[PDB]
Amino acid sequence: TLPPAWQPFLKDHRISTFKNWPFLEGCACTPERMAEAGFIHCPTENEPDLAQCFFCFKELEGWEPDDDPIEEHKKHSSGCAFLSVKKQFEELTLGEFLKLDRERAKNKIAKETNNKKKEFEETAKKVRRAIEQLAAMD
């Protein structure tokens, strides 16, 4: 057992998340390929094919059989450092692993910051709309 917070760096842990993934053999976006590209399966009732990059936390859905997970990851999150990792996990140096883990942590902060901004703006629009109606009154 490696420390639970470091498990997502292991491709086999990532593959294990795809318990009910619908795209299997014959498709480009098989669980092996999705896990290779850095994705974990995060299904919901609303979004059963929802997948998240463990490293940059980009969330993608609406997968089709011909979707190449690497190509999709590159298209939607071109700055994700995981995409530049050419080595296998075991070949990473400790220094490299630690640097990747700090970059992942910065990414998680960035994702939370982004979700907080989005939530606030949803509210600010509704508020702004209401006040716009009042201002429109004599």
């Binding site: 979004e47 929802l50 997948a51 980009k58 969330e59 993608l60 859905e61 609406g62 997968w63 089709e64 979707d67 999709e72 939607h76």
Partner: peptide, 4 residues
């Protein structure tokens, strides 16, 4: 795929 597309952003959620």
């Amino acid at each position: 795929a597309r952003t959620k």
